[PDB]
Amino acid sequence: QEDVVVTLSHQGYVKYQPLTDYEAQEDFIDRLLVANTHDTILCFSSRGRLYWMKVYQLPEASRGARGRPIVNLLPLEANERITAILPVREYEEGVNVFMATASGTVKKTALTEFSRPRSAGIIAVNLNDGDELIGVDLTSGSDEVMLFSAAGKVVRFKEDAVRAMGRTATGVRGIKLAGDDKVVSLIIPRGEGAILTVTQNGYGKRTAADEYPTKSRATQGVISIKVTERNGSVVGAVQVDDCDQIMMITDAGTLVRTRVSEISVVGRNTQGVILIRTAEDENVVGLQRV
């Protein structure tokens, strides 16, 4: 079973809705989740903290309705955004939480290490100044990990390469980042869906997942897309199936939805095609799979 849909918007309004009613009848859905009313959600923030919430503590609101600001439900600091929401019925055994920071560190902790909530939240990974927790997902012990950087680099390695650490551990380096570069996306590749990447000035592309070679961790990585001044930096990458849609938002509030099947499937050593035509000082700031 899975009863309701949890949504967290780009502006930080959170709500839930029974999914039957969610199926029937600016701001975009930044995280979507499916769970029971009495499931727990682990809310991981950009500051590297973790909060526990019962789904029923969220507002039940219709799909037109706005929801409640999550800053009013969690003890969030200034500019502390929710970067992951993970649903847990039972802290399933043999399942890992994998985390990735902008500075290229990664961390793997068993799900069960989070079975004891603290209402003030905990530190899920200690961060330095300016470093951010940019990705969290669940792995099974036998998954691969892909880290995507702003400069068009990607590293792909088996999750075995990261020793399962304790809840307090500081984490190891997942990718070697040159100079200004930062990790922007984490992907646990599953299935045959292609990798879609988009840049700041609206270029992007699909590349078959099997064309991303499995390297070792803590290397410099290979190229995922050629980043130029025309291109702009990589904003994000997601795995999509051919019937999926993506949504992109610029810092000018322009929202574009696009069916993935219309985006060309090319190699890693390209600049991409235009997915959204940005103005001169407009930059893509958000990518999300629908």
Residue numbers in the entry: 536 to 560, 575 to 839
What did the published study say regarding this structure?
DNA Gyrase, a Type II topoisomerase, relaxes the positive helical turns by introducing negative supercoil in the DNA and prevents the overwinding of the genome. Functionally, DNA Gyrase exists as a hetero-tetramer composed of two subunits, GyraseA and GyraseB, as an A2B2 complex. GyraseA is composed of two domains, a 59kDa N-terminal domain which possesses the breakage and religation activity, and a 37kDa C-terminal domain responsible for DNA binding activity. The essential functional role of GyrA-CTD β-pinwheel fold is to wrap DNA and present G-segment for enzymatic action.
The StGyrA-CTD structure was solved by molecular replacement method using the E.coli GyrA-CTD (PDB ID 1ZI016) as a template. StGyrA-CTD adopts the β-propeller fold comprising six repeated subdomains referred to as ‘blades’ to form a β-pinwheel structure. The GyrA box region from residues 560 to 574 is an extended β2-β3 loop which could not be resolved due to poor electron density map signifying that this region is completely disordered. The electrostatic surface potential of StGyrA-CTD revealed that the positively charged residues are distributed uniformly around the perimeter of the β-pinwheel across all blades. This indicates that the DNA wraps around the perimeter of the StGyrA-CTD β-pinwheel structure during G-segment presentation. The sequence alignment of the individual blades depicted that the distribution and position of the charged amino acid residues in each blade in StGyrA-CTD is significantly conserved. It was observed that arginine residues, R556 (blade), R612 (blade), R667 (blade), R716 (blade), R766 (blade), and R817 (blade) could be identified as the potential DNA binding site in each blade.
